[PDB]
Amino acid sequence: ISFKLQEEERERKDQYVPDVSALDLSHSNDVLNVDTQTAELVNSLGLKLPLSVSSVSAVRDRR
Amino acid sequence: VLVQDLLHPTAASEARKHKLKTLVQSPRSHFLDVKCPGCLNITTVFSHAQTAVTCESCSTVLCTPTGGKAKLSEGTSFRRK
Amino acid sequence: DNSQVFGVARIFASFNDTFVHVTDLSGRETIARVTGGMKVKADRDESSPYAAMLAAQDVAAKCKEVGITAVHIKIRATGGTRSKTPGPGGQAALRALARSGLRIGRIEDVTPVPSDSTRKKGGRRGRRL
Amino acid sequence: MRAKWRKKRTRRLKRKRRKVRARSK
Amino acid sequence: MGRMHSKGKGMSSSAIPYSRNAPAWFKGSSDGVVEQIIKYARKGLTPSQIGVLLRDAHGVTQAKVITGNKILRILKSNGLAPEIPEDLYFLIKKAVSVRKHLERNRKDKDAKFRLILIESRIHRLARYYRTVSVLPPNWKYESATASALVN
Amino acid sequence: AVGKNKRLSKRVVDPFTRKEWYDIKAPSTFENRNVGKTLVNKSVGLKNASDSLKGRVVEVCLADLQGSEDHSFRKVKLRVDEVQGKNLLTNFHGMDFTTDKLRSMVRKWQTLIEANVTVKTSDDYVLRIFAIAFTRKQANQVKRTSYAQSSHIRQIRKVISEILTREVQNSTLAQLTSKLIPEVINKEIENATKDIFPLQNVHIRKVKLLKQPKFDLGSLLSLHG
Amino acid sequence: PKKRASNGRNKKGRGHVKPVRCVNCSRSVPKDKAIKRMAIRNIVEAAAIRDLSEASVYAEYALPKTYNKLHYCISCAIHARIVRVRSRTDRRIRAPPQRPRF
RNA sequence: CUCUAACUAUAAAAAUCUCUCUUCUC
RNA sequence: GGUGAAAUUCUUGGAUUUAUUGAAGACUAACUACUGCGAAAGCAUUUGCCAAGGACGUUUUCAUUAAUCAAGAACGAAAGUUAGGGGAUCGAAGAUGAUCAGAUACCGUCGUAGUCUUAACCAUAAACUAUGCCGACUAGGGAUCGGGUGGUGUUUUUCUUAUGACCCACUCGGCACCUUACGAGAAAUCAAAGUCUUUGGGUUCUGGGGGGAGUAUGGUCGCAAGGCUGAAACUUAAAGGAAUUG
Ligand SMILES: [Mg+2]
Ligand SMILES: [Mg+2]
Ligand SMILES: [Mg+2]
Ligand SMILES: [Mg+2]
Ligand SMILES: [Mg+2]
Ligand SMILES: [Mg+2]
Ligand SMILES: [Mg+2]
Ligand SMILES: [Mg+2]
Ligand SMILES: [Mg+2]
Ligand SMILES: [Mg+2]
Ligand SMILES: [Mg+2]
Ligand SMILES: [Mg+2]
Ligand SMILES: [Mg+2]
Ligand SMILES: [Mg+2]
Ligand SMILES: [Mg+2]
Ligand SMILES: [Mg+2]
Ligand SMILES: [Mg+2]
Ligand SMILES: [Mg+2]
Ligand SMILES: [Mg+2]
Ligand SMILES: [Mg+2]
Ligand SMILES: [Zn+2]
Ligand SMILES: [Zn+2]
Secondary structure, eight states: OOOHHHHHHHHHHHTOOOSSOSSTTTTGGGOOOBOHHHHHHHHHTTOOOOOOBOOOOOOOOOO | OOSOOSSSOOHHHHHHSOTTOSSSOOOSOOEEEEEOSSOSOEEEEETTOOSOOBOSSSOOBOOOOOSSSOOOOSSOEEEEO | OOOOOEEEOOEEOOSSSOEEOOBOSSSSSBOOOOBSTTTOSSSSOTTSHHHHHHHHHHHHHHHHHHTOOEEEOEEBOSOTTSOOSOOHHHHHHHHHHHHSSOEEOOOEEOOOOOSSOSOOTTOSSOOOO | OOHHHHHHHHHHHHHHHHHHHHHTO | OOOTTSSOOOOOOOOOOSOOSOOTTOOOOHHHHHHHHHHHHHTTOOHHHHHHHHHHTSOOSOHHHHTSSOHHHHHHHTTOOOSSOHHHHHHHHHHHHHHHHHHHOTTOHHHHHHHHHHHHHHHHHHHHHHHTTSSOTTOOOOTTTHHHHHO | OOOOOOOOOOOOOOTTTTEEEEEEEOOTTSSOOEEEEEEEEOOOSSSOHHHHHTTOEEEEESHHHHSOSTTTTEEEEEEEEEEOSSSEEEEEEEEEEOHHHHHHHOOSSSOEEEEEEEEEOSSSOEEEEEEEEEOOOOTTOOSSOOOOOHHHHHHHHHHHHHHHHHHHHTSOHHHHHHHHTTTHHHHHHHHHTTTTOOOEEEEEEOOOOOBOOOOOHHHHHHTOO | OOSOTTTTTOOSSOSOOOEEOOSSSOOOEETTTSEEEEEEEESSOTTSHHHHHHTBSSTTOOOOEEEEEEEEOSHHHHHTTSSOOOOTTTTTOOSOSSOSOO
């Protein structure tokens, strides 16, 4: 079942957009953590973005 | 896949495939120049050697037969040919 | 140890007429052999839990008169080439042994399991029923 | 009938005929 | 991937390099290589072991690349080619070994079947070498006479 | 029930008045040397009981002899040989596992390797020893099985056989049992085959016994007290 | 017609395996076709765990388990409820019945 | 975005069955 | 004991169970799996000896020696047949005790031949993947066994390393498996049963409705059992395959 009040409330909750940013490195002191491979991707793309190399420790968890 | 070069495939794909299965079939083996600590003679050996190769000057083996390629001795130093 | 005079319960529970047979540590001396068919009428319920229950009460009373206060359970199935799965009555026998004052130590299963059977009875097509 | 038992009955008929022939061979 | 006398389907082999001429890095002389081949043959070695020795201890990729002739051809030019070709000789050696094993224990039937296979292979190879006149036309493999050739 | 065709083809007494209790004394290689009591007929002049006692084999859990529970799954058989009167002495007769542990470690998706060796100890006691080992899944093995090739199995069997021969011919079953209690042979066998294959659950089970040289009283009494 | 592409045996490349006997009816059945069920259970069930715990020396005695691999027949397996007839599109599934308890 | 634990345990006996089948074209 | 339940049978000359042991013969549990080897039957305790074999590696050697195969040959499960050996278990015949209307059938207890072997026969099985062999190509996904390559990989410990054992990637070969039809089929289904009316890579064997009939006869093999080869007269409108609804 649905009605005008519930649908309006759902739409109002849907229109919620945070004023603060959840992207563009607002967190982690304007640093994103990427491994070497995607760093070479950024390099070969011809683009200079603020990166932070970190090895991914190719040893896999035994699960 | 539908359209694709076979005359010029990537060299990575060349090393990927099996021997006898490249465009032109070429061996993956190679020869080596080994020096034994004993003398200064340079001995030419095969990667996949099948015999206990020794320098003619000294009765010291430089390779060891193995199911695949040669396992060299401990202190012999080699350069790829 | 506080001088717990020990025996071995040594239960043998086939698919019919379970056995409760307590002996000393050596096992060379047999006391209180009373079985399941010893105490029940129908001749078909010798394997029944009640059979082993009464047999267990009798062996407990006899051993308590003897002086043995704690027992070692040695559960045995019919074993050999047979089914070798424990009988229905043996568990009730063990429970009734543990009920009647006796102390319990080192339960073991001692069913005779072969490195192989000589030949299992029944023919190639087995019991057809 | 099964083919097995028809075959066996044929074999028994051959039994009788073979002994008859052997007695008169 | 045929395996004439079994169900095998392997293709384990060696790929001869495209360039027929001598490798650039090889410094030895063709005459020296032929002398080495002759000496190895005089030691009492079949051509296959000669090729193995020249490939392992020396830079000889293969004789035909360096000299221009094959190992058996080089031996034949100097008259050291064995009267029985090497592969057929090894087949007779294997056959006599299996026959010895059989006559020392009768009940092994699998080795009996393997002996049958080896004898069939021997017959095929003998037929080939006979149609090329390497062997005399009267040459044949017989169980009793194989030992003398092997011994 | 109570049915019997009486196909027989009061003089009743209680057979416990003519009976009594002896005590089982363990070798000094074990801690809790007071094992238990054994029921015996009363002594008769024509047939002395002490003759009847000797040869008895009592079966006791190993943990009941050392107090700890690390030896819960083992089991030791002691042989009655010398009776001191109202107390008798027992010598080692054999060793075994409990079927519970044995089935607990015989699990699927791993190869069990068994080693069998019949040897002679430092004395003339002749023993037979069985060792059982199980290949171990590596601490990184994403592959789910843990099988071992036949070559590895044969090598492991050879190593275990030579180790058991070494540690039997170099000691007596007094010292050999004192070695068996802290299962140092298990650790040594595991370490000697560490390169060949992981080998989880290296155990020595069912230490049999096939012969006794003579009746040596001196060490038997020396083994007690 | 083929009711089972696997033919039920699960052999695929042996020709012959050594038969094993049924636990119930003692039917000589091949070891791969025979249904094997690993009965691992408690030597004393929960009906008497409290009783044994109260009436046992060796405080905190870890009671032993009992292990038996049962080699059922196949008529027995249908009849003894061990295995059940399945839908023709359900016969595809070979995974065990989804972890009876977690 | 990290995970392998709980469980049993039924087989008594029951054989056989005389008809008759009928059209789809808007 | 045994059973649905009973009975036959053994037992105070003390059976059933209880501990040590001893003898015999068989067999190789658990490990044992959509795992391995083999030409197919088949092969599962350890160790040694004997020879053999697939797969992989090979800048080794010969150069068409090859594929399939009438005639001919080697092995060929179980059962069975001659003799000699053994003789535990289980068990054709048989002996009984039950169930039934009958039960010389199924349930039960004994039980010869046989099962186990050394020689000599036998040559048949639902000897099944009911799919002949060799060769090429066509589609995605993981695993698994044997081998071989590389990792600046991980634990290993013999200070470091070398192995081994894993981890990741690739490749060759094998028993296999999941998905799918874009192909094939009467469909069930098949990654071959595809590349077949858009019909031709090489090659061997077999079938022409059902029954009579794998019968008779004639050969041939076998001591025998029986094997291989193998019709017709006549009769019949169906027999049969897959699937759908009841
Ligand atoms: Mg039924
Ligand atoms: Mg059907
Ligand atoms: Mg199945
Ligand atoms: Mg195969
Ligand atoms: Mg008795
Ligand atoms: Mg085994
Ligand atoms: Mg295997
Ligand atoms: Mg033919
Ligand atoms: Mg036979
Ligand atoms: Mg005989
Ligand atoms: Mg009868
Ligand atoms: Mg009757
Ligand atoms: Mg019967
Ligand atoms: Mg019998
Ligand atoms: Mg046939
Ligand atoms: Mg066929
Ligand atoms: Mg016809
Ligand atoms: Mg027909
Ligand atoms: Mg004839
Ligand atoms: Mg149909
Ligand atoms: Zn030198
Ligand atoms: Zn069954």
